Amino acid sequence: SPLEPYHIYPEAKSCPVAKVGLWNGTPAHVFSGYEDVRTVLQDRRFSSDSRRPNFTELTPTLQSQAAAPPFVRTDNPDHRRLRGTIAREFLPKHIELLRPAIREIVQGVLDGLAETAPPQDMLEAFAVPVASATVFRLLGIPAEDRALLTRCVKGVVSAVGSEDEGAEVFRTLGEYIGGLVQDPSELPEDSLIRRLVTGPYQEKQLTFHETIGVILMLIVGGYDTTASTISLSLVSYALQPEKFSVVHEHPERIPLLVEELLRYHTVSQLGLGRIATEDVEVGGVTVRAGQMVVAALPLANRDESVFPNPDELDFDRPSVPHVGFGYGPHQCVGQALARVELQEAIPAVIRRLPGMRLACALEDLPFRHDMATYGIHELPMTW
Numbered sequence: 001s002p003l004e005p006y007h008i009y010p011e012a013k014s015c016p017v018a019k020v021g022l023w024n025g026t027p028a029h030v031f032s033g034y035e036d037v038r039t040v041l042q043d044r045r046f047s048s049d050s051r052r053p054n055f056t057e058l059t060p061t062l063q064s065q066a067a068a069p070p071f072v073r074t075d076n077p078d079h080r081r082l083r084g085t086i087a088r089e090f091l092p093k094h095i096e097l098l099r100p101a102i103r104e105i106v107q108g109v110l111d112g113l114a115e116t117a118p119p120q121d122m123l124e125a126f127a128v129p130v131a132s133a134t135v136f137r138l139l140g141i142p143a144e145d146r147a148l149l150t151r152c153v154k155g156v157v158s159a160v161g162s163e164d165e166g167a168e169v170f171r172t173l174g175e176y177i178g179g180l181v182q183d184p185s186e187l188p189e190d191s192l193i194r195r196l197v198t199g200p201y202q203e204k205q206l207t208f209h210e211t212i213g214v215i216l217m218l219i220v221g222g223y224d225t226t227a228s229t230i231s232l233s234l235v236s237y238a239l240q241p242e243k244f245s246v247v248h249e250h251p252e253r254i255p256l257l258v259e260e261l262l263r264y265h266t267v268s269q270l271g272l273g274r275i276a277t278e279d280v281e282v283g284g285v286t287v288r289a290g291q292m293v294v295a296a297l298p299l300a301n302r303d304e305s306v307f308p309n310p311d312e313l314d315f316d317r318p319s320v321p322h323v324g325f326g327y328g329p330h331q332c333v334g335q336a337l338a339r340v341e342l343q344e345a346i347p348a349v350i351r352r353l354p355g356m357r358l359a360c361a362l363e364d365l366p367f368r369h370d371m372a373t374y375g376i377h378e379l380p381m382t383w
């Protein structure tokens with residue numbers, strides 16, 4: 001099954017800590033249990049620092065960056081410093097101020113769609129425009145430039161790309177973004193890029209290339225992870241629309257419902273890698289210093305012991321805390337924004353198009369088995 005994540009690390013079907021080779025052959029202990037995963041991810045002995053001997057990104061494309069990564073591949077003091085430059089933008093209190101804008105962006109797209117004859121690729125026609133417009137508004141990216149940024153993001157996220165292909169992607173992406181860093185003048189005043197450039201960059205809290213790091217990561221997490229999550233939520237809707245009764249009868253439960261989609265559809269499908277900095281016992285296993293590990297989110301999000309009937313999409317759970325956004329210091333800084341988008345986007349589209357069914361067979365859809373984050377390359381829906 002394409003909607004069940006047990007194919008990624010088949011070894012974990014058999015054991016809660018499972019030894020496996022990564023793309024380049026490096027072995028890595030895969031943690032599949034929720035507590036173990038939570039443990040790995042706030043332990044100081046597991047590091048996101050890619051410059052360390054033996055660090056192995058989960059795809060070759062990302063490997064290409066290890067020697068000079070964005071902040072997602074840093075430890076303190078740098079992590080605190082870099083994340084610090086923009087953390088304040090994504091405080092739930094500030095992101096809430098975007099809700100009506102977001103809600104407008106959504107109504108915008110649904111207004112388009114309402115006149116269009118089905119079927120439609122709801123990725124291209126609903127999820128991506130919502131998601132991308134939202135973060136591009138926040139960032140201040142020119143409209144002109146979004147098709148390109150879109151293309152290049154698919155590059156970064158490829159799990160089939162090579163290390164030399166990935167270098168070029170990032171090179172190209174980086175040169176674009178460097179262009180805005182060096183000339184912020186064409187960007188809106190209420191733009192996150194501009195605040196970052198004229199503020200902490202000019203104040204030299206970070207370098208030119210660190211700045212590009214920051215922005216690049218908001219461009220990537222800002223819409224690809226969000227636009228897929230939307231997409232798959234629709235797939236679940238298409239398959240089981242009377243589970244979504246709630247949207248109509250229980251609006252105050254939408255927030256839960258979103259969480260439950262975050263759990264079920266853990267798009268960070270390969271989990272998160274970490275390197276041990278000294279020997280550490282977790283989940284009854286000693287991890288020798290310098291060993292890679294993988295925190296398998298989507299399986300931790302299906303760990304029956306914490307989530308009864310995990311393979312069932314179930315909006316009647318009392319609030320339960322998925323590690324969809326990860327955990328620890330590197331936990332998704334954009335999580336607040338994506339919650340909002342999903343809260344606004346998914347209800348909207350169900351209400352305006354509740355006969356949304358799949359315009360072709362589940363087994364025919366092109367699921368992203370070749371991407372570092374999951375989802376679908378196209379989602380033909382009729383209604």
Ligand code: HEM
Nearest residue numbers: 071072217221222225226229268325326330332333334338
């Ligand atoms: C469904 C939506 C999203 C999912 C599932 C997602 C998932 C994640 C995960 C798992 C990480 C952990 C990386 C690690 O620990 O090694 C992460 C980090 C990050 N996410 Fe997201 N995210 C989403 C949305 C966003 C959005 C909307 C933004 C920005 C607008 C964003 C920006 C980031 C950044 C900058 C990081 C790096 C955190 C750090 O190293 O300090 N994410 N995200």
Ligand SMILES: CN1C(=O)[C@H](Cc2c[nH]c3cccc([N+](=O)[O-])c23)N(C)C(=O)[C@@H]1Cc1ccccc1
Nearest residue numbers: 062065069070072073157216217220221225268373
């Ligand atoms: C969960 N996840 C990832 O592990 C990776 C990130 C990454 C892991 N190692 C990286 C090395 C360089 C650049 C990036 N980058 O900019 O996304 C990376 N990507 C790309 C992803 O789409 C997702 C979501 C995400 C995007 C941006 C920053 C954090 C998370």
